Amino acid sequence: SIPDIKLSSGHLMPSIGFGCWKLANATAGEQVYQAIKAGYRLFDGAEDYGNEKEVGDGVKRAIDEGLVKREEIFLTSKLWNNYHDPKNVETALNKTLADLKVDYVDLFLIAFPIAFKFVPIEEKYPPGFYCGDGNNFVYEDVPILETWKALEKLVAAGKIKSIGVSNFPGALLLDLLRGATIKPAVLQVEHHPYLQQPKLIEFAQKAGVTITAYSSFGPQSFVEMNQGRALNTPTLFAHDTIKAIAAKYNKTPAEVLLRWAAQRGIAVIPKSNLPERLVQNRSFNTFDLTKEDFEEIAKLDIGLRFNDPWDWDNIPIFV
Amino acid sequence: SIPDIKLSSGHLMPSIGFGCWKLANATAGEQVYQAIKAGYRLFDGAEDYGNEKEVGDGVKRAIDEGLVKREEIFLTSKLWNNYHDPKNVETALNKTLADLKVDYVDLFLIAFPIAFKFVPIEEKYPPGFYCGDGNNFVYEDVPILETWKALEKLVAAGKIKSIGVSNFPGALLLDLLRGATIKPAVLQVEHHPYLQQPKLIEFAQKAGVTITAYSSFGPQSFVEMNQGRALNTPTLFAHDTIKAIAAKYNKTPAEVLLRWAAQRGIAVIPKSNLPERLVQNRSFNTFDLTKEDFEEIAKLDIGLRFNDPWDWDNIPIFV
Ligand SMILES: NC(=O)c1ccc[n+]([C@@H]2O[C@H](COP(=O)([O-])OP(=O)(O)OC[C@H]3O[C@@H](n4cnc5c(N)ncnc54)[C@H](OP(=O)(O)O)[C@@H]3O)[C@@H](O)[C@H]2O)c1
Numbered sequence: 259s260i261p262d263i264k265l266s267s268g269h270l271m272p273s274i275g276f277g278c279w280k281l282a283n284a285t286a287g288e289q290v291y292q293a294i295k296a297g298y299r300l301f302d303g304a305e306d307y308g309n310e311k312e313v314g315d316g317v318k319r320a321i322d323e324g325l326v327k328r329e330e331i332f333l334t335s336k337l338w339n340n341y342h343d344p345k346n347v348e349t350a351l352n353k354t355l356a357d358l359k360v361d362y363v364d365l366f367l368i369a370f371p372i373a374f375k376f377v378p379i380e381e382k383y384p385p386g387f388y389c390g391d392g393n394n395f396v397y398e399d400v401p402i403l404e405t406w407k408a409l410e411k412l413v414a415a416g417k418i419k420s421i422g423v424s425n426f427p428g429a430l431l432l433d434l435l436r437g438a439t440i441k442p443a444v445l446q447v448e449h450h451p452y453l454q455q456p457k458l459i460e461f462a463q464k465a466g467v468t469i470t471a472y473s474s475f476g477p478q479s480f481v482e483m484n485q486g487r488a489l490n491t492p493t494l495f496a497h498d499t500i501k502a503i504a505a506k507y508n509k510t511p512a513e514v515l516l517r518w519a520a521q522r523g524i525a526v527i528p529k530s531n532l533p534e535r536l537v538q539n540r541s542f543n544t545f546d547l548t549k550e551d552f553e554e555i556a557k558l559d560i561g562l563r564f565n566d567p568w569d570w571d572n573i574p575i576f577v
Numbered sequence: 578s579i580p581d582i583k584l585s586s587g588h589l590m591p592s593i594g595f596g597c598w599k600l601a602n603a604t605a606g607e608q609v610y611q612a613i614k615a616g617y618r619l620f621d622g623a624e625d626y627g628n629e630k631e632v633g634d635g636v637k638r639a640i641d642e643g644l645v646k647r648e649e650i651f652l653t654s655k656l657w658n659n660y661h662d663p664k665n666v667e668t669a670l671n672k673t674l675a676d677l678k679v680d681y682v683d684l685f686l687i688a689f690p691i692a693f694k695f696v697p698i699e700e701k702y703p704p705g706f707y708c709g710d711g712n713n714f715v716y717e718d719v720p721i722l723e724t725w726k727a728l729e730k731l732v733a734a735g736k737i738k739s740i741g742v743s744n745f746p747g748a749l750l751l752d753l754l755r756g757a758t759i760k761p762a763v764l765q766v767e768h769h770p771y772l773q774q775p776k777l778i779e780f781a782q783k784a785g786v787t788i789t790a791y792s793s794f795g796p797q798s799f800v801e802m803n804q805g806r807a808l809n810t811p812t813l814f815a816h817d818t819i820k821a822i823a824a825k826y827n828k829t830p831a832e833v834l835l836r837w838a839a840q841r842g843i844a845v846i847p848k849s850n851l852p853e854r855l856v857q858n859r860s861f862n863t864f865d866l867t868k869e870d871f872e873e874i875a876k877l878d879i880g881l882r883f884n885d886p887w888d889w890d891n892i893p894i895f896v
């Protein structure tokens with residue numbers, strides 16, 4: 259029932275998956291297990307989410323019970339910023355594989371086009387913004403392409419099925435395409451009605467790169483982090499445009515928010531700590547938005563970005 | 578006074594220069610020569626402007642008459658898109674040197690982070706959007722860094738004093754800084770009240786990169802090009818904010834738009850076919866805008882870009 263998208267690498271990736279960012283290590287495993295029971299098969303994780311061991315626990319529990327087999331689960335992980343130096347790429351991946359308790363990850367992405375100074379895993383993991391010098395941000399001169407080649411080798415060694423990038427703007431994706439032997443199969447970016455970036459989406463899809471949207475619910479995911487911007491932002495759930503469209507089809511605002519992406523060939527990975535939202539967040543493909551619907555939602559695009567490295571240390575990724 | 582800016586390469590660059598874009602071939606020489614008599618010393622040219630030979634004619638005349646010596650003139654040129662393949666970089670630079678009738682250029686920039694398929698000089702020069710196949714755009718897989726390394730070798734060989742980039746967004750500049758041995762000394766970008774990109778400017782300047790603004794008058798330069806966008810844009814000269822400030826100081830709106838950039842350490846290269854505009858464009862450093870002025874002008878930033886490759890062939894440089 260969840261349509262699959264055939265990636266450029268030839269592998270199928272579920273168009274709807276379960277987001278694992280901010281799932282408490284306390285209930286993460288149980289919730290991953292429940293999501294599997296609710297039909298989810300793709301799990302979007304990351305070294306920086308700090309809960310890959312638990313994600314691995316949920317998946318393994320489901321495999322041991324005979325509910326699914328490894329090959330039916332799609333595991334996405336992301337290489338954190340401290341591990342871009344080629345000599346450290348496989349190290350990070352091994353940690354991810356060890357934590358997930360598997361021999362390969364289906365998709366491995368470069369989390370950000372940012373290279374923090376390397377911090378040994380034994381000194382601090384996940385490292386977050388720590389760069390080995392107190393609270394100071396420190397960077398390494400590792401061009402994107404160097405990191406990418408190291409990933410290409412790891413695909414050849416069979417530790418990764420498909421590789422891609424996250425948080426890459428157009429100019430950077432274009433340059434990477436010029437040097438890539440294995441084309442980035444996926445581009446994962448913040449994507450919701452307040453940040454539509456239609457030209458980026460268009461370019462990538464035409465280039466055969468599949469888009470996975472994150473934070474489809476806009477500011478929602480960020481208010482629990484006490485982020486001023488998200489808190490000052492009117493929710494999409496109570497937004498008149500979204501509510502009117504939802505009423506029109508007798509659907510929930512959440513369903514409209516997810517279908518808006520899904521209908522345009524964009525994969526989604528809604529995250530939820532609430533059991534009842536599990537089925538709801540993957541059963542929204544029951545109606546079609548009209549061109550007029552899309553034009554009305556288009557008016558919400560204001561370029562409001564919630565996940566911006568500029569906030570961390572004025573890193574110019576999106577300027 | 579025309580203050581000099583010390584570039585990261587150790588060389589001085591006049592903070593005020595003369596743009597050569599769309600300077601007609603029949604009069605370019607005279608125009609450059611008059612510019613020199615009026616005190617200009619930096620000339621912003623480019624292979625794609627197709628008038629480098631005539632710009633060279635003007636400079637040579639001024640030198641032959643004794644008005645200036647070569648070392649007193651700062652010549653900037655740009656590597657067009659069809660010449661990014663490392664093996665074509667020196668041949669393009671050599672065509673520029675032969676046209677300008679000089680042994681070295683003071684600044685040579687990558688015109689765009691775009692790589693068009695090589696087209697022999699003998700076949701078409703300047704090539705413009707022609708890519709060797711009718712009206713079809715055809716690109717080469719040449720990563721920015723490869724082109725950059727070719728430029729570094731030309732500096733070592735003494736054919737270029739300082740190198741830089743044009744039309745590079747933040748993420749791309751950042752990545753280039755990771756692989757560069759000679760750091761790009763300059764970032765030349767479209768810069769005016771409608772497209773302020775304050776974060777790009779701040780990052781570049783903090784990174785020690787000098788900013789050269791182009792199209793300081795916004796839509797104006799693109800008007801004679803019959804560009805839809807520019808034609809439908811309320812001018813900056815007539816914008817109430819700019820008018821009020823110009824009136825307040827008894828300066829033309831043009832003087833305010835140039836000083837607005839200059840006071841913030843940004844170099845300008847105003848282009849003008851008229852004599853009085855020529856002198857005014859080099860004599861506006863006689864007043865300082867106040868913090869309130871800057872705050873009022875800051876309000877115009879709507880991110881309106883007139884020079885966007887997206888319009889050529891949906892090239893994602895700025896998305
Ligand atoms: N590559 C990157 O940089 C990056 C960054 C951010 C996110 N991501 C990935 O994308 C995933 C999804 O994005 P996200 O987690 O940031 O935010 P999201 O999925 O848009 O956030 C969902 C937020 O809304 C609530 N919610 C979930 N389903 C709902 C529903 N049906 N109705 C009303 N509210 C609902 C959740 O609360 P409850 O949990 O209480 O239900 C949660 O606070 C992440 O988990 C992660 O895997 C990647």
Ligand SMILES: NC(=O)c1ccc[n+]([C@@H]2O[C@H](COP(=O)([O-])OP(=O)(O)OC[C@H]3O[C@@H](n4cnc5c(N)ncnc54)[C@H](OP(=O)(O)O)[C@@H]3O)[C@@H](O)[C@H]2O)c1
Pocket residue numbers: 595596597598599621622688743744765766790791792793794795797798799829831832846847848849850851854855857858884
């Ligand atoms: N790197 C790049 O991609 C790029 C792209 C564009 C430009 N550039 C460089 O930047 C230079 C300047 O940019 P630009 O020529 O596009 O835009 P600009 O300098 O803003 O163009 C000035 C336009 O405004 C008029 N003008 C000049 N001085 C004036 C004054 N004092 N009062 C009122 N109007 C005035 C000119 O008309 P008249 O000639 O009739 O006086 C001309 O049409 C170029 O020549 C080129 O060297 C680089």
